[PDB]
Symmetry: C2
Subunit: 386 residues, 2 copies
């Protein structure tokens, strides 16, 4: 069923009520996005703030997506880094308080992964995943979409993060876009003789990047191996709590694209998906949920609670529709405690501690010689894999 | 250490060993200080957990769990028993902490340990350690008559009501404090003394803040009532020494008089000059024992200006001991033992931000939340230990 699960028919008849396979599928990719949050170092008191904690090796095992995750059989092949030519909120780019850490202007911004042979059998094809890390004025986008599309405009923030470079940086000397295009290109070429898909996921900031990236790829025909320009693969973005990305011309361009599909999951009480409230259009198919229907969620919630990704995945796990009279019931075995990674989101009744995601001792570790060092980063040169 | 132990343990009141600070004593003080800090490192302060107020770790390999094995060749002790306490009167959350929702009125209050055969060789004798857990987290306690502790012969001695309550109170309904913290400690120290009656033995008691008041009280109790002798050998008393840190005051002038008349007791009160806790209660109390002043404001590593929490914290104290060269304006400060400065930040943002050590870094991975074999996520912040006699 993978082609329909990936939106071949725009998820028609699969959303209300929610198809059980799709429920698990959506969570599967949403977890891909969440992994971004779980490796991202947000400790501004560390020299590695803004970097990944974990290396590519056994990445998914390290972020808790191995145990009881028989479908998450992917190898991370490349880490993605981004910068910005203009000032942006700390939620987008975060830096060591030192101002002299691992990088002055760049952040780990996501990863590119692919199914191994086992995952390929399980998902029914070779799945290339690009996962964009999320949130901790309009500009002309010709440099992206070409003269033929010279009326398309994009959110200045999303554009800057996607397109900016730091010439002095080993990380962002090439922009996030090109890093991604290059690695997806290598994967497409390697598996050109095989059924392939590209899946792109992201939450909040990551959702705007997932949407931009996907449109870019399809509109510029990067969804084809260079050796086989005759062979396009499906590109579909699973995005969560997506702000708006472009203007009406962006939508027009989007709407004319054969090979693209976007499923925007929206939590009704979450206001982020409304921004920017003026001059922007949404793209893709929408899937509304409402976490206020969960008896596990604290009432009343707040900005952070309504927005948080694990909240979103808890909603997908249990949603039975958003009408007043609809049920809420967990139809997959998804630990409710996951909600509290980054918020105090559950009813205190649940007795799960709030905001529990942290390295042991924040990464401080006793060494063989009895010294104590901050070890919150695994070494990875991020060199192309063979 | 083995050769000098009796002097290191205060036989001569540390005369001529404090200013300037004797190098062996510097390491000795830190070694017991670390015994107290281990209490903080094993105490669950997460009030959102059902185990708040309990120990995270079991007795087994206790010291390796709290980071006192690597590069700690002199810390070869076995923890034999966990100690629990309650209070008949209301006391601050810093004293007894409870789940927001394992126990309704008790907290893990410390442990009793002894040096194994290796440790014994290393420390020059069989050292029995009693370590009292201290003040955590963030009613004008009066003085109570302590007859029930020191007997009618000592009927004028008065003790801080809070220290007394924590030391002597019981919860009949509880498997943990059906007997009070005092009795739990006396009974296990008794067992150990009897076991090692035929060898040279010592009792060392340590504590910081609340734990320091308890350490002082319990030491005086044990010596004044002659609990420092095996039951089988009433003729053999061992030295009892308390290494206490940031000690509030414990008793009145009669408590001091009783204390001052005791052969076998020694107390070294390390005091951080900018730390105001050791001044409390400011009225009607006397201090006991020998004093050792340090001043962490002299450290170039410590954030300036400090605050209540910074001046008081135990690791701050141990950093001060590690580098003190006197408290005069002109005295040096220089680390004369290899003690990681990052230890200062276990429970505070105490170091200069320049040091680039994250503040308040002590925490279980994911606060103890852990993925299970079946893919569920549970709060696992407690190791099972029935605490039965070994």
């Amino acid at each position: 069923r993978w082609r329909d699960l990936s939106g071949q028919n725009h998820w028609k008849g699969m959303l209300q009520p929610l198809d059980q396979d799709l429920r698990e599928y959506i969570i599967h990719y949403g977890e891909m996005a969440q992994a971004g949050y779980d490796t991202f170092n947000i400790n501004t008191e560390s020299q590695f703030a803004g970097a990944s904690i974990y290396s590519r090796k056994d990445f998914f095992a390290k972020v808790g997506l191995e145990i009881a995750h028989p479908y998450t059989k992917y190898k991370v092949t490349k880490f993605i880094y981004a910068t910005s030519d203009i000032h942006v909120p700390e939620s987008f780019l975060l830096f060591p308080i030192s101002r002299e850490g691992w990088s002055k202007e760049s952040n780990w911004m996501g990863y590119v992964a692919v199914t191994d042979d086992q995952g390929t059998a399980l998902l029914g094809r070779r799945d290339i995943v690009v996962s964009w890390r999320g949130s901790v004025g309009l500009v002309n986008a010709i440099k992206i979409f070409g003269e033929r599309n010279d009326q398309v405009q994009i959110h200045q923030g999303w554009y800057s993060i996607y397109m900016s470079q730091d010439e002095r940086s080993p990380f962002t000397k090439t922009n996030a876009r090109d890093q991604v295009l290059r690695e997806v290109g290598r994967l497409l070429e390697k598996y050109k003789d095989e059924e392939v898909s590209i899946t792109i996921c992201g939450h909040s900031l990551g959702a705007a990047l997932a949407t931009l990236s996907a449109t870019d790829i399809v509109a510029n025909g990067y969804n084809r191996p260079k050796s086989r320009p005759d062979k396009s693969c499906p590109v579909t973005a699973f995005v969560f709590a997506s702000p708006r990305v472009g203007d009406s011309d962006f939508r027009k361009l989007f709407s004319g694209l054969e090979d693209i599909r976007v499923l925007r999951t929206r939590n009704l009480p979450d206001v982020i998906p409304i921004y920017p409230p003026i001059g922007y259009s949404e793209v893709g198919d929408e899937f509304p949920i409402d976490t206020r229907k969960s008896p596990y969620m604290k009432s009343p919630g707040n900005l952070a609670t309504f927005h948080c990704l694990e909240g979103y995945l808890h909603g997908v796990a249990g949603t039975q529709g958003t009408n007043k009279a609809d049920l809420f019931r967990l139809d997959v075995e998804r630990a409710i405690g996951l909600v509290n990674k980054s918020v105090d989101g559950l009813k205190d009744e649940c007795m799960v501690p709030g905001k529990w995601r942290v390295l042991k001792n924040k990464g401080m570790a006793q060494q063989d010689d009895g010294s104590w060092e901050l070890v919150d980063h695994e070494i990875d040169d991020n060199e192309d894999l063979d």
